[PDB]
Design a binder for this molecule. Structure first.
Ligand SMILES: Cc1cc2nc3c(=O)[nH]c(=O)nc-3n(C[C@H](O)[C@H](O)[C@H](O)COP(=O)(O)OP(=O)(O)OC[C@H]3O[C@@H](n4cnc5c(N)ncnc54)[C@H](O)[C@@H]3O)c2cc1C
Ligand SMILES: Cc1cc2nc3c(=O)[nH]c(=O)nc-3n(C[C@H](O)[C@H](O)[C@H](O)COP(=O)(O)OP(=O)(O)OC[C@H]3O[C@@H](n4cnc5c(N)ncnc54)[C@H](O)[C@@H]3O)c2cc1C
Lengths: 494, 494
């Protein structure tokens, strides 16, 4: 029943993980598998593989955490964590790092009240106590901004003359610590996984850019793909895993909401990065500002990322705040498809005066402002306070210099959001079982790199009519559960 | 009775203004006057004069405002304003610019309540209504941060779901506008005044650094000054007007509190500076953050200065907040005198990563943080608010880019504070009437450049025993009043 030939479009998280899974399944050793990508991962006179700097996985760090709410994504990334702690994370591809999870509102133990961004943490805190051995007694909690600042070796921001508010219903930064978190060098991870796939020798890799799907004369099936250079590749099954370009290739402007975000890096000195690492510097997440910081990484940099648009929706929802649908979203992406710069990420130009020099400069201004406020509130000498906060006797000058340091580099990365934030790993219903879609990674798919190819492979086999494939032993989510969660959205077809 | 020979040490605000006054008084055309300064204002193959980049007057802008509280400094700078609007401000040396005066607390018309930094404004607002024609009806008032932001062509920072607080006793940024304010190009001003003094031909100018005073064998009088190069200059009267170095030259570690401050400049494009000027961009003073902004200036830059240490004392006092005496202040300056970098200002080095590279790097961190917070609160897309402030449909992208732009240059400037913030323009009582001190400019002396030399000259003549000198007509402050206000502090002598 299984397919006899494959074309995988996209050597990213979904596609390259699929190629790897099929390379381990001996039932396909004789079958022809083609993995085509725009980017040449093995250019001439290069040692090993180089990752695609325009892909959404191109980053020296990606955050892997798994205290997400109970569900299928709950059990999926703890399974992935076993690989990040094993062979996938060897040679420093994975790093462990405590994570400080924070927001603004009333005390963390106090029940959720409306209109407080802490409610996103209170949900993550209540669940963290359930999974972590020891329960709520083994989970450290910081219940004020000045506790978070002290936690990093900084001074209090609160003015001296004003008295500390004992009321636990007043507004302040609230936060908890989780130790079973870390980050992976996403680039080096892809490069290693790529070298692995090449060694197993079961997969043919092709440099080329897919321009159209190809159908038969009846248009009841997909034969393969047509490249921009003329070549036409044919196989029994064609898998679209092109990241942010998938809606374009598939011709479905509503399948994903595609939009870019800017990411900032501050370079540290060897001495500074050592100082923070000795302080056990954590990954810092502040959902009230929409900013998180990771590092110091393998380049001795602190990376500052932003909550995506869909991500801020969830935070504000948990606080009983509706936000409108994203401007210029969903089908509006189609007028951009002709631009080769759309869905194309990587380094961003900087002007003489230090501005972002990019055709999407205005989109960058909000992220950069949030990053600087996040920095000053935590690492600056007075938090966000004015002159009534005295104490110029009291400061950590190393943290202050970081908080005033201009961003050293800026990069651009593209999201690929779905309505329910669920992946789409299913068959296009119009063409029987000849065209498979594996995309919609939103803003959280990289962590599942080691296991997503396997789950994707079982979905390819099951929904062909064969129910023999069931997933091993008692691993949850179930294969039947996953086929539901990543069903092809048919609303768009009719 | 008048002196027969002069030595003026310091071609700055006090000294150069004195030389100019004596150059207009015909009673001294035959008398020998010497103005010695470390810096050569007329170097070879240079056209005209160049200002001393290490002096405390070396800046492309200095703020001239005169709605200071009622008193002698009240009537003194309105007199000076007539010259800034006349010959002293010709050839663009003076610029007019509205001024937005602001702080944090309850509504501006509401009476002062304790612990609110607005109280400094409420005093300045209540007095502004007294001098300005029309009274309180002719004075524009902005009573919320979102009114100040709207006043500059920016969006509201307040979140949409939260409702506007109608209570006028809640905390917010409050501010008023004064139109009779501006700024002078301090450097070009000194250079012109210098060329004026040279043309009148009555004053001899000497390049050299004073190392010690010289006394007679009885030490009941001062003969002159000894230079580092050996030269000894003699005159009947020696005038110490060496700015921040005066305590050193005089050997009185307690006479002034000497400390540096860092100043920041963001460069604008021609189009941006034009846009703000078309918007009637004001000088912005926020005493809650201790920051003010001036420009765009003649280089198309925005300059960000900080309230001095003594200046923040006054703001917090008006709010019923005592602050301790400055660390490392007053007599502690003496261990620095041997360093040629002490009391020496000008451009500051920037590291590879963009840090301030200066032996006083830690002192800079507070000012730079305050500057960025001031910028973001007023010009950033969300003020200081987080993600609950939506409205990414709504932004002024030009203001946002400025608020994210790294500081282009940083300079250092030294203050020269007194206990009561009053100048010291009097005779050293120990040496009869042979040694005169004209220093202690604190942080507000530059504006008085056109008239301070005249007032200084009358004080030189009066306190010699001759009461004939009285100051013309009915100009206040009185000469007797000024001799009191700038009396030599004898507490230090006994
Ligand atoms: C700033 C940012 C931060 C993120 N943070 C996190 C995080 O902390 N943790 C986390 O787990 N995830 C995170 N994500 C999400 C994660 O990086 C993505 O979900 C993941 O990269 C999805 O990969 P993909 O396979 O869908 O596409 P990608 O990884 O982008 O790869 C797609 C590949 O398909 C190729 N392709 C595209 N079009 C064509 C064509 N026409 N022909 C041939 N080839 C083509 C591309 O060249 C590319 O190589 C983040 C994403 C961004 C942008
Ligand atoms: C950052 C900053 C912002 C300010 N803001 C304002 C403002 O907005 N408005 C305002 O009105 N004022 C302001 N002030 C204050 C004003 O600039 C000063 O009060 C003014 O410069 C005082 O001048 P002075 O004559 O005392 O000394 P200076 O103007 O510094 O000149 C002193 C001169 O004496 C010379 N000298 C020193 N030692 C010796 C020696 N041993 N031998 C020979 N010569 C010597 C120096 O070389 C120098 O040329 C500010 C000051 C600073 C630093």
């Amino acid at each position: 029943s299984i397919p006899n030939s494959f074309i995988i479009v996209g050597s990213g998280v979904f596609g390259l993980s699929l190629a790897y899974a099929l390379s381990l399944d001996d039932r396909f050793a004789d079958k022809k598998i083609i993995l085509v990508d725009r980017w040449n991962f093995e250019p001439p006179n290069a040692t090993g593989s180089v990752h695609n700097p325009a892909a959404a996985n191109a980053d020296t760090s990606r955050v892997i955490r798994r205290d997400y709410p109970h569900g299928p994504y709950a059990s999926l990334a703890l399974e992935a964590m076993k690989h990040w702690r094993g062979k996938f994370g060897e040679n420093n591809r994975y790093v462990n790092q405590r994570l400080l999870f924070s927001g603004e509102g009333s005390s963390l133990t106090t029940p959720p009240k409306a209109l407080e961004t802490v409610n996103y943490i209170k949900k993550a805190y209540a669940i963290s106590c359930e999974l972590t051995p020891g329960g709520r007694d083994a989970v450290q909690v910081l219940d004020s901004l000045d506790e978070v600042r002290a936690f990093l070796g900084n001074t209090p921001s609160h003015p001296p003359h004003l008295p500390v508010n004992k009321d636990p219903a007043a507004r302040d930064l609230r936060g908890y610590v989780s130790n079973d978190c870390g980050w992976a060098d996403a680039g080096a991870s892809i490069e290693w996984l790529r070298q692995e796939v090449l060694r197993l020798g079961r997969v043919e890799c092709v440099v080329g850019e897919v321009e159209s799907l190809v159908y038969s004369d009846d248009q009841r099936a997909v034969k393969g793909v047509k490249l921009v250079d003329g070549k036409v590749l044919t196989a029994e099954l064609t898998v679209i895993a092109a990241g942010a370009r998938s809606s374009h290739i598939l011709g479905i402007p509503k399948l994903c909401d595609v939009y870019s975000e800017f990411v900032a890096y501050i370079q540290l000195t060897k001495e500074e990065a050592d100082e923070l690492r000795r302080r056990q510097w954590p990954i810092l997440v502040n959902c009230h500002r929409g900013v998180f910081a990771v590092g110091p990484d393998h380049d001795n940099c602190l990376k500052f990322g932003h909550f995506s648009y869909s991500g801020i929706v969830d935070v504000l929802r948990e606080a009983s705040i509706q936000v409108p649908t994203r401007p210029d979203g969903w089908e509006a992406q189609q007028k951009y498809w002709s631009d080769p710069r759309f869905a194309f990420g990587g380094e961003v130009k900087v002007s003489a005066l230090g501005d972002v020099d990019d055709y999407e400069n205005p989109a960058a201004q909000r992220a950069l402002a949030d990053y600087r406020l996040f920095l000053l509130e935590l690492l600056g000498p007075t938090g966000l306070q004015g002159v009534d906060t005295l104490g110029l006797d009291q400061s950590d000058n190393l943290l202050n210099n970081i908080a005033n340091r201009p961003f050293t580099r800026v990069r651009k990365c593209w999201y690929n959001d779905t309505p329910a934030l669920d992946f789409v790993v299913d068959y296009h219903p119009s063409y029987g079982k000849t065209l498979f879609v594996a995309t919609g990674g939103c803003d959280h798919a990289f962590k599942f790199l080691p296991i997503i190819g396997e789950k994707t492979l079982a979905l390819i086999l099951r929904n062909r009519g064969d129910s023999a494939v069931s997933l091993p032993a008692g691993v949850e989510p179930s294969l039947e559960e996953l086929s539901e969660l990543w069903r092809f959205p048919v609303e768009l077809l009719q």
